[model samples]
Target: SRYKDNRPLNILGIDISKMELGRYNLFEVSIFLQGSYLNPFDPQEIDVEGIFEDQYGNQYRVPGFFYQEYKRELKNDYEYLVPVGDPYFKIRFSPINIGSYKFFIKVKDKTGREVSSDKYTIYVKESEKPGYIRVSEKNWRYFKFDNGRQFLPIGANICWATSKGTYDYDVWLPKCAENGGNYFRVWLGPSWATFALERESVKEYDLKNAWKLDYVLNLAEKLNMYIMFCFDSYNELRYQKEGAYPYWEHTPHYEKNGGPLKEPKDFWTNNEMIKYYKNKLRYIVARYGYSTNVFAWEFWNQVDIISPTAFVIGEVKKWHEDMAKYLNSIDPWKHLITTSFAFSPGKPEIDSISGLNFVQTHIYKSNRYIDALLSLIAYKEKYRKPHLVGEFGLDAGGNDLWVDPNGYVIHNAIWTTILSGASGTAMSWWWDNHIHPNNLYFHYRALADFVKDINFLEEKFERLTNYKFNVYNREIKVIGLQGKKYILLWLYNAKEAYQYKKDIPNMDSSKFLGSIELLIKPPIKVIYYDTYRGEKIKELDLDKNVIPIIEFERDLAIKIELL
Candidate 1:
């Protein structure tokens, strides 16, 4: 043999040639064994599997394209085709929200394995609407809502404490209302409080917990807050080990791997599951649909883990269409209808006109982390419906918990989105004491004070431009309407200790806005404020035109007005 038992490996190339689609989707894996390999067992020990997700969660499958001995020399290159006989590597129903999907590949030699390769993500998005939502001419300078109201959109997510009866949301709900948070979201599970929660007795979900509905609705109405009720939380029922079906196991026709009683079988077209979803939704609408505090209803929290194969694309679209139609039929007021979709931009699966209100997206990942803020504001021109940043926050060290650099980064991002025309934003921080201290609570409250009062931010501001020069070494985001009046600028210093391995680069703050001058027609005045310290800076002449360069250690804010 010309080659040694384990020769030098230059590159191990893996590719997915044929995509299998059936009850589930299968990814055919192909490995290009380059370099040299010796001994009789080298070729027989290769391994590979396609990675994907189903409803229950992430799933992997070794496609028939990896089977050994049955090699075929089809093409001109030295490509030996080995097929694995499995079809489980499928994707769950397409994402109803905008999010991301990543693919990972690993490779090793015959001698009990050796090395691996870098992972890649597949970016997918539902199709976009033809044109943008146009602002009216009369109040073109002010932000407007679909319901003919002119107000700034400020909101928060009532994520937890729904099932738990003791926690009084009334305490915080009023605080948010007082701070100008006009919108809030409530999450619900599949069954009514008792039916799905405690299998033993519906009594645990008694009138006390049920009263939460009236209390929240009444509170929001009294406070004039818009309600965005999320139907289900992420993978609550789908991923449980025993009682619920694993998200990856639910297929319309696939067999359940002896999971749990609460898990539904015949997922694709199961009448029981469909009825379960519909009845719960209808019940929710009948209970709270008439309330003025209500804004929109979200179908499922994160329904992407439904299938392990790519076939989830089709199924998710169907679910949204049916759900939208069903909800619309019962509620004639035509409340804003929407579903959160995965970040796969332009994916055909969610390209339906059923009852989709405006597109709702949940942001995660680095690629999405930065652009999502600006894009969410500017992209609205393409889709007329109002855009709401339902859930947004950043994590520098990974996982859901918020850290310093990530928190600062998100702070700047929020300003960018707000100035770019986003109606409102909900700064998400769980109520747990571990992650948030009382000092942090006061800090959060202060942060909300600066931008919450402005009612036009969610509706009026349309054009967004990042002041690259204003950013200095730190990222400075400026958002506001073009040619109208005010400018909202938010700046923050964000550099992780580890990220600064060497001496941090000195930022020339003075050089920011060194180039551009404002063309403020006579009578415009600029108001500046210290968002953190809650102090107001001097108002300057709009005609000065020179870029206002400000210095700060952590945070900065500016508001421009046409005098």
Candidate 2:
């Protein structure tokens, strides 16, 4: 044989992370094998599977993938990952049932030679983990954990680790978590942090990036947060342009390169290209699908920016239709899946895909709060599915945070979505600059506090529009949600949003007399709140069916539930 290790393939040993693990938690195992192989990623070259049989004789055929360990190193002022040990094969699994499991890892080489490790028993204890997140059955426009817990995402888009690989999350993630933020977005395809399906070789993925993703996901699990795992970006597919942002030269998906497609557009219909991507998707599900923290698999960011004309949408829609079905068939957990577009109004043809669990819209260069609320309602009403303002910014280039300097853009984005009946909070795009540098994470904390212990599933929310509520002196902006038992209202000065150079105007303190008559009946309980500070200003138990006149400044959140 030409290979250095020509000896007969055999299972060396198996190392289990725990003899007693928790249900719905990581049950990781490292399998050492003595074999000579040129392509470890290809299952035909080296197929590995963890054979797990529960006490009730239920067998789970979980596929295993190649893995390598890494440690963070700071050389100069930047942080990066340094591989510590040679590559090995491992399997990640989670037990949904509490009982004993009979497990063994099976490894087979390119030849018909197959070997199995000695059988081992592991005990699974019942865990408090809420389990994987999915679209709520109780309400179509919301999300719920497997254990029937409602979730409202309160966070931003922390996409692309700039220079700092895992270290970036080490700093940003903890900050968000401390501020009661539970959801954030990140891309796995940025050149610096290409987790899988890299630009270099279509046949193999970068092990270094894979190691970093593992670290990031593991950290999210510990911090009790969710990640929208973006799998693709327009940057990788856009043709090289003049003196601007195009990266076609870095892509290996065309005939000129060693890939299978003749052009990027052919990605929609090319059978060979589709086949390879499906295989890559299989690898992704096998590697990280075991974790509950990997919330959603976003296919691409601003993919519509590729072929802007009308004809391109038909092709894009078909591609998503084909790929999303394949993703659903493989991912047993059925995590939420959605894609985005540069334009706020995403392609209707693609957004309505049945396999896509929810819809996502990215907005920029406009009024942040009202625009997001308008887009949110349009999407939810059109698709009859949960809608997410996945990414938004006052300035497309992300410099508006500096323009405001008071965190109004950040403040409005998070608070506006709650009453707009969106699936989650509006995700801002500048974590490194807008959030961390300015320490604006406190915005998420206030929203989280107001929604705490509130069951979104039980709240059959209907966004009330064009209300007949009597207006007074000045025109004001109002967003209210009518639930089965109560009404959630957020009233703020319409001018406060436009006030950048001057301080925010508080209605109570303003000399101008302004108030709105809320059209409601008697015996309604009101919990008035200071919107920015998240403190209840006062509570009123109204017994008469009198019209409640509201006077406020800056912003206020009120929970006017019925008795």
Candidate 3:
């Protein structure tokens, strides 16, 4: 069984790519096998598993996924890829400890024939790699790594790349990371960047798409960023419907697409549909689950817009819980799980499910961002889980992509949402069209500098509602977080700012006649920071409650700490 020599069932060979790997780094196991099957995509005919043992004598049994090697080239001003070799089996496992580990592969057929590779040993070395992200043990509302390092996400959405494939990310990701971005979202459902199971057939995955995602994940890892990989979206639930992505007919879930389901509405509770969906997820987890850069696994994008008349709330809710449960069970690294909706107060039936670790809200074309802030809080307080603004834009139809050349809405949304109590920065949409064209990377850079090294898990923080300092209360808005020993505040003069000019034209006044005050105990130190410039303008030590005149710009951030 050492080589494929015209055998009906046998292990061809196994190759270990490295004798040693860094801690929390992938250990690749490449396998070749000979088997008979009606379809290679059907796991019922051919199945493989990689069994590993660590220094502590604990065992890690990871599934082996089908893979094909691919090479790429540039064609007609775009990127293209094609298969280079025959399909093989691969198992990727992240070694958690820095010690010796032993592993072997097991391949089997449905007829009870099985073959095993020779056992092998590999050592894990010390490296700077942090383990996977999970809900913080120090504070359930935040996130932390396996090594106990706290994480605060500050980034936008780069869900899918264009025809350029990984080349698109080469231009976008580094710019984001250079500006203090540590998190972004991605969609893997038949996307231009990558599609796992929507092409060729329901079972046969696009190897080129999967390869593109691999490249992106590797790039994100080097840049110290995280990705929220989304599974499906509303586009897949409707057939050529207005505003949808026109992908329902292409999905194997539809009866017209040579699949088992009768209609899109049957995606929720249909057992046949569940089998096909889970089959793809199993391959996904097998291939990409080892990376610590994966922040969370999003179940769907904007499920709230999936035609409520046919959406059967209970069935959809149950489907969410069921899929989340299955994903958690198979993902050995245990990444965070979440889903998205059109509004902040997402479906209680689905959002409240315990399987989901967080809630996501997508807001667009809004009259003001105050409601967006309130929506982030609405889901957080009602569901008792942290909430995030997954998508925010000035216009849902992308009208403002060219109008706001300087990314005014982008700058305002990230600042206000965080100070207003979002788990992280408000992730704006149109990363490719607006952010790239307008060069709005500086907005995130300023925010990243302000929040650098600030640990949300170290303190019990809440909304800072009791503050006193503005003569023009209607024109000057304030939002902040109050901690055990300090208060962080963002004060904005709406009349002086352009982003909120339309939202607050009635109350336009940038001038302050007298000094603003904070009605708190004395002997406190206050530092004023320019939010956009990322510079410290002034510092005041108050012996008494009152402080004298100081320069106040269009927007200012202040930190008041007890002495």
Candidate 4:
């Protein structure tokens, strides 16, 4: 007999009575089964399905899984706990439209007996905002909303709070929003917003962490900020000896925890470890895939350091290709998927992978701001896809933020990135100490306000070259993009502002030089902008072909529209 004890199937109750959600948001339901009739541990023996019916009589099928020991919580003391007897079989569904929808669960037991649960109802309301961000068809280089509004991501990497008292994402997010920022990155490291872990034989997740993530996502949605949800970081999964603490020792996949894997490389080769990793991926997709606030699902952060000894360059490429495909297959909404590298300059293998939607890289060099400009240009030319500098900072001898207090490095980094044909601003790594405390968010506001009136999709702007400028003594770098009717130019001082000296560079106009002569294609109308003031300072129409000498104190921006 297929029956374990000749007992019948009995579903005690459904966890959700009724769901009230916004359109395009995730809706979940859990079915509680009588412990006497079924063993939650052997979930594979039970097959479950969810049939959803909308008011229009259209039906959709969704699969369900049995999860044991569902929730885990990690306290400040580094100890963790899991609730007892709270396991259940769960199913997830997303409502596309605002209307009344009904769903019911059907289950098959080991003995081939079937049971049906009571039908449940869900009401979805229209979302207050426009919609999620998507790649624009007009121009493949930029992003737009579902409502067809152009989006330019301008912000820094505010991954998570460094400490309990400093977990003030509430303050940081609002500060960004209030200052015309719209994007940020968050990581799932052990120290912040972690969920799944290998324990005993199966993968378990902490619900408290899930709730905290829920809060972050909800807050982001409320503030209209898109998040790049990075899955794992280097130190969180690597086995390091000399530097920072290695999370592998305390990680659930460690050999001491009865896990099948021994090293970081085993996570890719070992079948048992891969199965647990897939389970974690499935849970993440099932829980948060419906939210449009997520800009993209990043596979890992700084993947080179995951396991340096076992890191085969070829296997790294294979892992990203296969894993990106897997993530794409499971997610119904088809959220953009990407992976980031630390040491490499636009990992060609990962960038060439057809499964990935975009390319990303990080840099921290001693050269002037043009390094960022050149890096963005290289990635764009190499990949031909949307590219971004995910993390960048000044090489101030160490990782401390207090060394560069003037914020000149970050200001130049952001402008050079945008004007050089990057998808968004170059994200700075110093978020809490340098950016927030010093009130440097106005840089984002200035840039946002500068380009708010222009429709990026309508204008096909390509990077311009062969423009000559005359500015002596100071190294002046010119980067710009030209559209059919308009040309945008950014001129900045490429000289090193500081060299570890005591006094920072002063912004005194007395030390600045005279007018800059720019050679341009003639018959154009020029609009000079004060980038710091976020306003157009002057506009002139030149009828003849000649080099126009423009006056400025330091850096300047000019937009020329062909007549």
Off by over 4 Å in 3: 1-7, 190-193, 472-474, 498-516, 546-553
Which lDDT values do the candidates have, in the order given? 0.46, 0.76, 0.76, 0.69
Q: Give model 2's TM-score versus the native structure.
A: 0.93
Which 10 successive residues of model 4 have the least lDDT summed?
501-510
Q: Stretches of candidate 4 above 4 Å error?
A: 1-10, 15-22, 25-50, 53-93, 97-102, 106-114, 118-128, 165-167, 191-202, 242-245, 397-400, 472-474, 496-523, 544-553
Listing every candidate in turn, what is its Cα RMSD in Å to the true structure after a full C-alpha superposition?
23.9, 2.8, 3.6, 4.9
Per-residue lDDT tens digits of candidate 1, residues 62-170?
Answer: 2112112222232442223343442111111222222354455544445555454466444334432111122323333233444344544465565545333323455
Per-residue lDDT for 422 in model 4?
A: 79
Scanning candidate 2 in windows of ten residues, the lowest lDDT window is 507-516
**Tens digits of lDDT, candidate 3, 187-231:** 877433354456655656777788888889999989999999988
Clash number for candidate 3: 0
In candidate 4 the C-alpha lDDT for residue 218 amounts to 76
Q: What tens digits encode model 4's per-residue C-alpha lDDT throughout 377-412?
A: 655656666776788787665453666665667767
Write model 2 residue lDDT over 1-563, tens digit each, in one string.
Answer: 12223557898778889989888999899887877566676676777898888899887778888877878797766777777777678888888788999998888887779888888999999999999988889887888888899878888988867676677789999999998989988886735443545646565677777777888889999999999998877766677762236655567665676777666677777787777677677778878888999889999988877633222777888888888988887775667789988877788888889988889877775554575566656556678778888987785466677687667776776677777788878898778777888788877887888887678789787885545545577566778787777777777667766566666444342232444444455578878777766677677787654334456656777787777
